[PDB]
Amino acid sequence: MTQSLFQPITLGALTLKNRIVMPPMTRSRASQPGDVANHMMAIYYAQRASAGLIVSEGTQISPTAKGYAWTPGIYTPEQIAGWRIVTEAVHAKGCAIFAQLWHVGRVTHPDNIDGQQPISSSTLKAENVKVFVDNEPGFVDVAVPRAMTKADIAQVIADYRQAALNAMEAGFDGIELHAANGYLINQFIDSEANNRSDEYGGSLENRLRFLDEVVAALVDAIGAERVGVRLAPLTTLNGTVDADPILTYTAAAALLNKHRIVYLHIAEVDWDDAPDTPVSFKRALREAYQGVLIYAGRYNAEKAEQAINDGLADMIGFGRPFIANPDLPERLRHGYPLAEHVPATLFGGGEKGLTDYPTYQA
Ligand SMILES: Cc1cc2nc3c(=O)[nH]c(=O)nc-3n(C[C@H](O)[C@H](O)[C@H](O)COP(=O)(O)O)c2cc1C
Ligand SMILES: O=Cc1ccc(O)cc1
Ligand SMILES: O=Cc1ccc(O)cc1
């Protein structure tokens, strides 16, 4: 029935139109050279501004934080200006937008990071994990990362902190820390991906240290009311696996709650990796974290409404459906049929498969 889904909600200093979120979705359409957010991306996001909140596709915080060809960066003056075009376009439509600050850690190839060697919590390679390269050739197997030294850690935190400032300069309403889907921070969090012997490995407290320090920096830079964090407790598609996900992530949620981050975003499904997410686990997260809770992963109107009314979620993200339906909210509200996206145009290319999905017309 969707009544709650269409109720507004306060997100820090923002008052959002509804509970629908356009989750972060890499489309790899950044202008070359320079990986700059561009005009077609601005049109793309503005077309979907009826969402209550838009979270931008992952945007790398540095040259070595990139994992896929043509993804937009947020560290150069040009990239900031490029993103500004996007946020202004989105704001002109009346919608809030957060920048997803990204660092892929070991999920990359030297070709995508100026020949450099990928960094990670440890020297563990992601099993059968491929990334894309060039400016095109194709997919290639990820490389072997090198364990991050204390200097590396201080640098990445620095890059995250500056990226946050750059996001504000770019006009974003806030930032989302990508600590999910097997990327850098996730590589510290999950036990089976972190084999460090120092303060950033071993115990649960140590495995959460990097997340704690990065968030501390982000909050210090732009305020907790403008900081969101994304986690992926149960999925493992990109190579990260935890030994006790339920405990690790309930703890992570409690930790983030202390930082008073504005929202916690849970990535429940990653492609066809949809692990059963116990309602009991969801209720524990609801108690561990008291802010705005967002979930994304195979939701339809019914399941979204039910998640909100059961007290499990405050907002719900719809990813793939938003790709093919710029007016997704209107369709969900009326029960109009949803167009399906074309996998072949998800990444790279131009406007085709990006801005030419029409709004609904009976
Ligand atoms: C083309 C595509 C690119 C994605 N890129 C991102 C991203 O950059 N960052 C992220 O955290 N999740 C990313 N996601 C995951 C989505 O945000 C979302 O959690 C996922 O698609 C599950 O929701 P859905 O079943 O409604 O599509 C991507 C998904 C797709 C389909
Ligand atoms: O096919 C191109 C491509 C670019 C970046 C990716 O993330 C995935 C695919
Ligand atoms: O398909 C690209 C992709 C990028 C980042 C993720 O978090 C998940 C998917």
CATH of the domain at 87: 3.20.20.70
Q: Which of 297, 295, 299, 224 is nearest to 264 (CA)?
A: 295
Contact 10, 314 (CB under 8 A): no
What residues make up the domain containing 17?
Answer: 1-362
Alpha-helical runs (H) found in the chain: 39-47, 77-91, 150-169, 184-189, 204-207, 209-222, 245-258, 279-288, 301-309, 320-324, 328-334
Torsion region of 184: left, alpha or beta (phi above 0 gives left; psi -120 to 50 gives alpha): alpha
- The answer to whether 155 is annotated as binding is no
- Report, in angstroms and rounded to the nearest whole number, the Rg of the chain calculated over CA atoms: 19
Whether 181 is in the pocket of ligand 3, judged by its Cβ within 6 Å, is: yes
List active site positions: 183
User: Amino acid identity of 41?
Assistant: M
Using CA atoms, how far apart are residues 152 and 150, in angstroms rounded to an integer? 5
Angle at 139 between CA 138 and CA 143, to 5 degrees: 130
- Tell me which method was used to determine the 3D structure: X-ray
How many Cβ atoms sit within 10 Å of the Cβ of residue 102? 30
| Domain count along the chain | 1
Contact 326, 357 (CB under 8 A): yes
DSSP 193: G
Using CA atoms, how far residue 108 sits from 177, 265, 346, in Å, is 18, 24, 19
- The answer to whether 350 is annotated as binding is no
- The answer to whether 100 is annotated as binding is yes
In terms of residues, how long is the chain? 362
Using CA atoms, how far apart are residues 252 and 124, in angstroms rounded to an integer? 22
Helix H or strand E segment including 229: strand 227-231
Query: Which ligand 1 atom sits closest to the C-alpha of 176?
Result: 11
Contact 285, 295 (CB under 8 A): no
Distance 203 CA to ligand 1 centre (A): 30
Q: 6 in helix, strand or coil?
A: helix
Query: Which ligand 1 atom sits closest to the C-alpha of 100?
Result: 9
How many Cβ atoms sit within 10 Å of the Cβ of residue 137? 10
Q: The tokens 């959460």 sit on which residue?
A: 208
Taking the CA atoms of 68, 73, 79 and 84 in sequence, report the sign of the dihedral they define.
positive
Using CA atoms, how far apart are residues 71 and 278, in angstroms rounded to an integer? 34
78: tokens are 């040009």
Nearest ligand to the C-alpha atom of residue 343: 1
DSSP 230: E
